[PDB]
Amino acid sequence: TIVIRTKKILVNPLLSRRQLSLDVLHPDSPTASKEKIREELAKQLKVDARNVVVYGFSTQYGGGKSTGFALVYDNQQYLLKYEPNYRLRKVKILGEKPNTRRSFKELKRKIKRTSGKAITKLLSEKKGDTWASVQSKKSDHLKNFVAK
């Protein structure tokens, strides 16, 4: 079985979450997948699964333990407003970050070297995943949510 000692607990109203250090004891088993650690933690603290973010796990040498960290947001509204985007992808909420640099710098090339009309015509074609689209997928996912 998985035991979870919950260690250092800071109540953070500012970001409206609880910050957590975690100790997982898995004496007979491989390092615990985050799905399981999430679920066991939620079982302990009575909150929703998708209200808890679990991160940064270190199994020690010899394999009885892992130490990790957790976050529990008050509402998934906040959680959806605070966690950064690569994390929302780990949780499948957001998407892929496509290849930015190359595009952006060749666009920089062409943009610098012409004037307004053409510039706008290039900007229409930019490969970016817009901040608009981000907040849109966030809101939409907040609209597809069901409270526990």
């Binding site: 800071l10 953070n12 109203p13 500012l14 970001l15 910050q19 605070y82 950064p84």
Partner: protein
């Protein structure tokens, strides 16, 4: 050197912040403000390192750009990540109603002194200059860069006013003389607290004062680093708990580990 320097490297950031040697290249360069760069504790460190309310950079930004107005210094809102919260300032976090005072402990690192509500109204101010202003209006200036008008005329230079931050009205004051209580803002004697024995003026340059504490160890420091804590043996502030008495490492080890 072509003008102003906009960066700060972690190795060069003051020891008082207790930053990790290995934590990065840069640290946060304190903003121009009420306090000097070396006497600054910036907000970003106040939140990230001390309170741990912010885990990283992004987080700090979140707190200080959130429409909700989370952090207060001397009653006034601050949204600037590098705002130089200095000595004697009262920083207050609206969400938890935590009210802290910015201080140095005997080891010269920055500390947040938890204050109850009655403490948090008051803040200690130290007179820098005293002049007649325009229109023949007497004025006074403070370490936190206040300018105070129509001061009580008895107030001399280098005194300590007790300032009501609700009323913006100086309440009581005391000056630098034999027999008052000090805190020491800068020195190898930084953080120590004591009764002024006397003051010697050398008049070319630098005037030195001597100090005692509750235990009876003498100190000395230049006048500039003395900050007055009230009249008598009583201080108008709740001190971080050393009470302002330095401990020999022998004393430290004894009391801590029972040797």
């Amino acid at each position: 050197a072509r003008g102003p320097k906009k960066h700060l490297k972690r190795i060069n950031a003051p020891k008082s912040w207790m930053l990790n040697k290995l934590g990065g290249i840069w640290a946060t360069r304190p903003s121009q403000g009420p306090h000097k760069l070396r006497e600054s504790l910036p907000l970003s460190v106040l939140l990230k390192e001390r309170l741990n309310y912010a885990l990283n950079g992004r987080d700090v930004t979140l707190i200080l750009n959130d429409k909700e107005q989370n952090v207060f210094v001397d009653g006034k809102v601050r949204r600037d990540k590098g705002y130089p919260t200095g000595l004697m300032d009262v920083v207050r976090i609206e969400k938890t109603d935590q009210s802290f005072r910015i201080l140095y402990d005997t080891k010269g690192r920055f500390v947040l002194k938890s204050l109850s509500k009655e403490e948090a109204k008051y803040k200690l101010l130290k007179v820098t200059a005293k002049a007649i202003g325009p229109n023949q209006i007497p004025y006074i200036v403070t370490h936190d860069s206040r300018t105070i008008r129509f001061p009580n005329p008895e107030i001399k230079i280098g005194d300590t006013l007790k300032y009501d931050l609700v009323n913006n009205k100086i309440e009581n004051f005391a000056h630098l003389e034999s027999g008052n209580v000090c805190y020491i803002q800068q020195g190898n004697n930084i953080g120590r607290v004591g009764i002024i024995q006397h003051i010697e003026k050398h008049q070319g340059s630098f005037d030195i004062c001597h100090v005692k504490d509750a235990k009876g160890n003498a100190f000395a420091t230049r006048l500039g680093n003395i900050f007055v804590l009230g009249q008598g043996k009583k201080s108008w502030i709740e001190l971080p708990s050393g009470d302002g008495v330095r401990e020999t490492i022998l004393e430290e080890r004894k009391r801590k580990f029972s040797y």
